[PDB]
């Protein structure tokens, strides 16, 4: 085990004006051609998704992608009220692999039901990793990778209620968020989620959370309050900040046979004055562009918080963007050959 | 607060000529935050300049705005008939966002004299409560003109109301009317009634009068 | 996170203030 | 997109009026709103305004303690309540918000100017604080180039519409503004000049029209005196 300079490993094209390509060129580098994956024989490696510096390396690194390409018109840190430029951009995250340098290789937990902290049996070793889309969001984890056998619950400390719980799903549920054209508030948008698919997943999640809380009861309520970014589903859709009210997604009403089934349309809005996930402060952007704005994402995860005799109430949480990267780098670890 | 003294109160110019208005601030302003408005007496005001230099949406290019710190200026390359109005400036950096006093871009034309007529009360009116003497000043430039009513050489004070027309569109002159309010028991007991006009277009004070009946 | 303000807010609703990363949470 | 005001309201001393300002499209989310007034024959007077970047709402010392600006939940309609009215508050109340809101994105204009620029203005909510009630006007003739006119006296509220000989005499016609009196009512005079040689062949009539009190007076002005 060790902790080294894990360099950004790209897959970008040196001629696209898309902002995730014009940043990988500068920080990331080309990928390893034929990546190694030899199955380590009779090996027991201990992992900790909450300590793997790959999370720190990425968080520190993803910040640079937003500073370079998502400059807000006005930043409002403590005291100073800085101004700069607001060029509208082409925005669509591209995957980032994290190769290791010579002397160190990445151990990859190939277990199906490993929860995040403990031993992995089927341990392999690789140079790069599978692609990671740098999607910043709250409550729901988008455009990731799915679980392989069952839904897995990942929490650094379940008893510590203030810790966010990560739910990794075994089947995806697409979410199609759209700001329509003249078809009229240009700041108004909506997201469509399959109610039949979603409630079946929530039911599966509801059944899974029983096994971790002594087979008791489950309740999904809406967040208490505070910043919109955590009380609503927030994400960037092609340079536009979306905030979507997820009251209809976490509706205990629809986890028997009633009026579920139908399409779940969430009222969303496009904020210009948003809170910064870089650090403490607020920023301000420009109003949206002409035409259609579309984002067909894939809910591959859910970020939940607990209030903490019987019932156990949960809330859509998130906020700590470090945990977004922990939903994709849990199966990786850096050691050393020398 | 920040007092915003504009200058002058009335800017007398003819169309085609250049107009230059000045908005001075008592204290310094965040130069990026000063706006100019225009109100044509009849409708609502509207934006012409924001940020001391940035034109509003759709304003003709003849409207130049500039300045910094405490010394600001609204410049007009050439006047047109749709620009003779009142103009205001506004600091909105540090609240309270105070306004200026105003500047009327007037049509210069030339100097003219008041066509003055007086009206005795109506026979239909005296049958009722009051008598009302009226003094008409017609087609005169410039704006300032004063009237003092007199009855039997008495300098009447606190018994009149005045009003002026907006600049005549065709002839660019004004019209004024003062009105002396009298109860009939104070109108029948005197006799001589005269309004006194004092204007610069007149070489000396002018008077029209009548005797009761 | 701005915790002071976070706590200041969530007592308007009658709740305590929690930093959730760079953002404010109420319980 | 334009802002829709409340109607012209006649209030009584010691009451409280609340003006509306509804926006057709969009919201007031980013740059907010600002309230302004203009007293009869006066300049503009800043009341208050919302500044949504700092999440603050402020007023002036002349109006603080009795003026409150509110909005909806989504900031599509904003209000202004003025507790304790007075004749000094008889004015026209305006409403201004930013045009960079909605519209779209201009290549084009500056969006790092976070303060409300106030380029979309309201219709105007004329507010009259009086203790008087709807009274019909009296039309007395101002009998005599020559000058003649009608005298519209003692009415409430404004406006009245005077027009001579059924909209056929507009050459040299002067319609003067109203003047609020000591009694609390209004009055104005409409006058016109003519050729002196016409005071003997052409009849001049003025039609005064007050619609609050359904009044219509077509007075006939004639010369001759002693
Ligand atoms: C994760 O698995 C380990 C197995 O060693 C177990 O001790 C731990 O309690 C599990 N944690 C959660 C949150 O399931
Ligand atoms: C170890 O994981 C790989 C993943 O591709 C799997 O194919 C393989 O079957 C696993 N090993 C054994 C002995 O099953
Ligand atoms: C997903 O996992 C749950 C158990 O957590 C299981 O009931 C369900 O059948 C699984 N579905 C798929 C498609 O793997
Ligand atoms: C989890 O938090 C509790 C306090 O809430 C603490 O006592 C415990 O040590 C934590 N878990 C671990 C593994 O340290
Ligand atoms: C997503 O929604 C938009 C608008 O309703 C539509 O044009 C598009 O075809 C949808 N995409 C999918 C994959 O259904
Ligand atoms: C939602 O998913 C269910 C099952 O996966 C499917 O039967 C239904 O057609 C879907 N709804 C829509 C609107 O496609
Ligand atoms: C979400 O919608 C519900 C519907 O009742 C509303 O009460 C709530 O305020 C909305 N959430 C936010 C953050 O506005
Ligand atoms: C919960 O489900 C019921 C049943 O269809 C629905 O009528 C209601 O709007 C839903 N409420 C929320 C907050 O999602
Ligand atoms: C998710 O992936 C789809 C397909 O590439 C893309 O169109 C969409 O913009 C992505 N969504 C986000 C939030 O990155």
Q: Where are the domains of chain B?
A: 4-107, 115-211
Residues contacting residue A188 through CB under 8 Å, at least 6 positions apart: A179, A267, A268, A269, A270
Contact A239, A88 (CB under 8 A): yes
User: Residues of D119-156 as b/e, b for ≥16 C-beta within 10 angstroms?
Assistant: bbbbbbbbbbbbeeeebbbbbbbbbbeebbbbbbbbbb
Residue A150 lies in a domain: yes
Q: Which architecture, in CATH terms, is D1-131?
A: Sandwich (2.60)
* Domain coverage including residue C15: 2-27
Q: Measure the CA–CA gap between B154 and B160, rounded to whole angstroms.
A: 14
Nearest one of D41, D56, D47, D43 to D21, comparing CA atoms: D47
Residue A10 lies in a domain: no
D103: left (phi over 0), alpha (psi -120 to 50) or beta: left
Task: Give the number of other CB atoms < 10 A from CB of residue D205.
Answer: 17
The gap between the terminal CA atoms of chain C, to the nearest Å, is: 15
Q: Name which residue sits closest to atom 9 of ligand 8, judged by CA.
A: A248
Q: Is A151 in the pocket of ligand 3 (CB under 6 A)?
A: yes
Q: Given A74, A185, A284, which is nearest D26 (Cβ)?
A: A185
Domain count, chain C: 1
For chain C, the residue count is 27
Longest dimension (CA), chain D: 75
CATH number of B4-107: 2.60.40.10
The gap between the terminal CA atoms of chain D, to the nearest Å, is: 62
Contact A47, A117 (CB under 8 A): yes
What would the 3-class secondary structure string for B177-193 be? Answer: EEEEEEEHHHHCCCCEE
Task: Give the number of other CB atoms < 10 A from CB of residue B130.
Answer: 16
Give the fold, CATH level 3, of D132-226. Immunoglobulin-like (2.60.40)
CATH 2.60.40.10 positions along chain D are 1-131, 132-226
Q: Is A48 in the pocket of ligand 4 (CB under 6 A)?
A: no
The gap between the terminal CA atoms of chain A, to the nearest Å, is: 10
Phi/psi at D106 (5° precision): -95, 140
**What are the C-alpha distances in Å from B175 to residues B135, B140, C3, D150?**
11, 7, 66, 15
Provide the token pair at A108. Answer: 């990859």
Nearest one of A132, A169, A131, A134 to A304, comparing CA atoms: A169
Residue B57 to residue D141, Cβ atoms within 8 A: no
Q: Measure the CA–CA gap between D192 and D172, rounded to whole angstroms.
A: 6
For tokens 């409560």, the residue is B129
Residues contacting residue A42 through CB under 8 Å, at least 6 positions apart: none
Q: Measure the CA–CA gap between D188 and D179, rounded to whole angstroms.
A: 6
Q: Measure the CA–CA gap between A55 and A324, rounded to whole angstroms.
A: 9
Per DSSP, the three-state class of D211 is: coil
Determine whether B2 is exposed, middle or buried from the number of CB atoms within 10 Å of its CB (0-12, 13-18, 19+).
Answer: middle
Atom of ligand 8 nearest to the CA of A248: 14
Q: Measure the CA–CA gap between B86 and B201, rounded to whole angstroms.
A: 25
Residue A13 lies in a domain: no
Task: Give the number of other CB atoms < 10 A from CB of residue B207.
Answer: 12
Q: Measure the CA–CA gap between A104 and A100, rounded to whole angstroms.
A: 6
Q: Measure the CA–CA gap between B72 and B35, rounded to whole angstroms.
A: 10
Query: What is the secondary structure of A114-159 as a DSSP string?
Result: --SEEEESSEEEESS---B----BSSEEES----SSS-EEE-S-SS
The beta-strand segments (E) located in chain D are: 3-5, 9-11, 16-23, 33-38, 44-51, 56-59, 67-71, 77-83, 91-97, 120-121, 125-129, 138-142, 146-155, 161-164, 173-175, 186-194, 204-210, 215-221
Residue A286 to residue D111, Cβ atoms within 8 A: yes
Task: Give the number of other CB atoms < 10 A from CB of residue A337.
Answer: 9
Per DSSP, the three-state class of A112 is: coil
Determine whether D58 is exposed, middle or buried from the number of CB atoms within 10 Å of its CB (0-12, 13-18, 19+).
Answer: middle
Provide the token pair at A78. Answer: 């403590």
**What are the C-alpha distances in Å from B92 to residues B32, B98, D32?**
10, 7, 14
Shortest distance between the Cα of B32 and any Cα of chain D, in A, equals 8
Q: Are strands B10-13 and B103-107 parallel, antiparallel or unpaired?
A: parallel
**Rounded to 5°, angle at Cα D74 from D71 and D77:** 40
Provide the token pair at B132. Answer: 């009302």
Residue D188 to residue B90, Cβ atoms within 8 A: no
Residue D30 to residue A273, Cβ atoms within 8 A: yes
Q: Are strands D9-11 and D125-129 parallel, antiparallel or unpaired?
A: parallel
Q: Measure the CA–CA gap between B78 and B64, rounded to whole angstroms.
A: 11
Q: Does the domain made of B115-211 have the CATH classification 2.60.40.10?
A: yes
Per DSSP, the three-state class of A286 is: coil
Per DSSP, the three-state class of D136 is: coil
Domain count, chain A: 1
**What are the C-alpha distances in Å from B80 to residues D87, D101, D117?**
38, 31, 26
Q: Does the beta carbon of B96 lie under 8 angstroms from any beta carbon of chain D?
A: yes
**Which CATH number do you get for residue A243?**
2.170.40.20
Q: Measure the CA–CA gap between D106 and A290, rounded to whole angstroms.
A: 10
Q: Measure the CA–CA gap between A235 and A237, rounded to whole angstroms.
A: 6
Nearest one of A287, A297, A284, A17 to A178, comparing CA atoms: A297
Q: Does the beta carbon of A174 lie under 8 angstroms from any beta carbon of chain C?
A: no
Q: Measure the CA–CA gap between D120 and A271, rounded to whole angstroms.
A: 21
Task: Name the experiment that determined this structure.
Answer: X-ray
Q: Measure the CA–CA gap between A169 and A301, rounded to whole angstroms.
A: 6
The gap between the terminal CA atoms of chain B, to the nearest Å, is: 58
Contact D88, D81 (CB under 8 A): no
Task: Please check whether the two domains, B4-107 and B115-211, share a CATH topology.
Answer: yes
């Amino acid at each position: 085990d060790a902790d080294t300079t894990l360099f950004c490993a790209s897959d970008a094209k040196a001629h696209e004006t898309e902002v995730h390509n014009v940043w990988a060129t500068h920080a990331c580098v080309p990928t390893d051609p034929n990546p190694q994956e030899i199955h380590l024989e009779n090996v027991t490696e201990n992992f900790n998704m909450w300590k793997n510096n790959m999370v720190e390396q990425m968080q520190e690194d993803v910040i640079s992608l937003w500073d370079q390409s998502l400059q807000p018109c006005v930043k409002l840190t403590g005291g100073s009220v800085i101004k700069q430029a607001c060029p509208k951009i082409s925005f669509d995250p591209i995957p980032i692999h994290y190769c290791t340098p010579a002397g160190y290789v990445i151990l990859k937990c190939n277990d199906k039901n490993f929860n995040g902290t403990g031993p992995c049996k089927n341990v392999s070793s690789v140079q790069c990793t599978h692609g990671i889309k740098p999607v910043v969001s709250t409550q729901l984890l988008l455009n990731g990778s799915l679980a392989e056998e069952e839904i897995i619950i990942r929490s650094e400390n379940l008893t510590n209620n203030a810790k966010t719980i990560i739910v990794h799903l075994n089947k995806s549920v697409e979410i199609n968020c759209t700001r329509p054209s003249n078809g009229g508030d240009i700041r108004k948008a909506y997201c469509e989620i399959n109610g039949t698919k979603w409630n079946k997943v929530l039911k599966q999640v509801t059944e899974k959370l029983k096994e971790h809380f002594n087979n008791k009861t489950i309740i999904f309520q809406p967040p208490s309050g505070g910043d919109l970014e955590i009380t609503m589903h927030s994400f960037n859709c092609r340079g536009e900040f979306f905030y979507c009210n997820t009251t209809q997604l976490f509706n205990n009403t629809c986890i028997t046979m009633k009026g579920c089934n139908g399409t779940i349309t969430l009222p969303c809005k496009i904020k210009q004055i948003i809170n910064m996930w870089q650090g403490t402060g607020q920023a301000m952007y420009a109003p949206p562009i002409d035409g259609k704005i579309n984002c067909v994402s894939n809910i591959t995860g859910i970020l939940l918080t607990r209030d903490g005799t019987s019932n156990e109430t949960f809330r859509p949480g998130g906020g700590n963007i470090k945990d977004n990267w922990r939903s994709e780098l849990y199966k990786y670890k850096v050691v050393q050959i020398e | 607060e920040i007092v915003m003294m504009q200058s002058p109160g009335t800017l007398s110019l003819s169309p085609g000529e250049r107009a230059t208005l000045s908005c001075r601030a008592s204290q310094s302003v965040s130069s990026s935050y000063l706006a100019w408005y225009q109100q044509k007496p009849g409708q609502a005001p509207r934006l012409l300049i924001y940020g001391a230099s940035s034109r509003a949406t759709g304003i003709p290019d003849r409207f130049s705005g500039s300045g910094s710190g405490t010394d600001f200026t609204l410049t007009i390359s050439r006047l047109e008939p749709e620009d003779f109005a009142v103009y205001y400036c506004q600091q909105y950096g540090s609240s309270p966002e105070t306004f200026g006093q105003g500047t009327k871009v007037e049509i210069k034309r030339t100097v003219a004299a008041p066509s003055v007529f007086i009206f005795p009360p109506s026979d239909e009116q005296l049958k009722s409560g009051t008598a009302s003497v009226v003094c008409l000043l017609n087609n005169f430039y410039p704006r300032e003109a004063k009237v003092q009513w007199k009855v039997d050489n008495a300098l009447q004070s606190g018994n009149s109301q005045e009003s002026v027309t907006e600049q005549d569109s065709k002839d660019s002159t004004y019209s004024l009317s003062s009105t002396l309010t009298l109860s009939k028991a104070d109108y029948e007991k005197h006799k001589v009634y005269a309004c006194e006009v004092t204007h610069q277009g007149l070489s000396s004070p002018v008077t029209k009068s009548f005797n009761r009946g | 996170x701005n915790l002071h303000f976070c706590q200041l807010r969530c007592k308007s609703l009658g709740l305590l203030g929690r930093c959730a990363x760079t953002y404010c949470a109420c319980v | 997109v334009q802002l829709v005001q409340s109607g012209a309201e006649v209030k009584k001393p010691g009451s409280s009026v609340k003006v509306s300002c509804r926006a057709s499209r969009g919201t007031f989310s980013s740059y907010g709103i600002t309230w302004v007034r203009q007293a009869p024959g006066q300049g503009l007077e800043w009341m208050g305004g919302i500044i949504p970047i700092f999440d603050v709402t402020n007023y002036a010392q002349n109006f603080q303690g009795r003026v409150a600006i509110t909005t909806d939940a989504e900031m599509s309609t904003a209000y202004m309540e003025l507790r304790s009215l007075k004749s000094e508050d008889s004015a026209v109340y305006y409403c201004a918000s930013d045009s960079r809101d909605f519209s779209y994105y201009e290549p084009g204009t500056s969006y790092s100017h976070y303060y409300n620029i106030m380029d979309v203005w309201g219709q105007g909510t004329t507010v009259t604080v009086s203790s008087a009630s709807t009274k019909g006007p009296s039309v007395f003739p101002l009998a005599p180039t020559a000058a003649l006119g009608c005298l519209v006296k003692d009415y409430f509220p404004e406006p009245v519409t005077v027009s001579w000989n059924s909209g056929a005499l507009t050459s040299g016609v002067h319609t003067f503004p109203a003047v609020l009196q000591s009694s609390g009512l209004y009055s104005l005079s409409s006058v016109v000049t003519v050729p002196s040689s016409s005071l003997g062949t052409q009849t001049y009539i003025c039609n005064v029209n007050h619609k609050p009190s359904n009044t219509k007076v077509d007075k006939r002005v004639e010369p001759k005196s002693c």
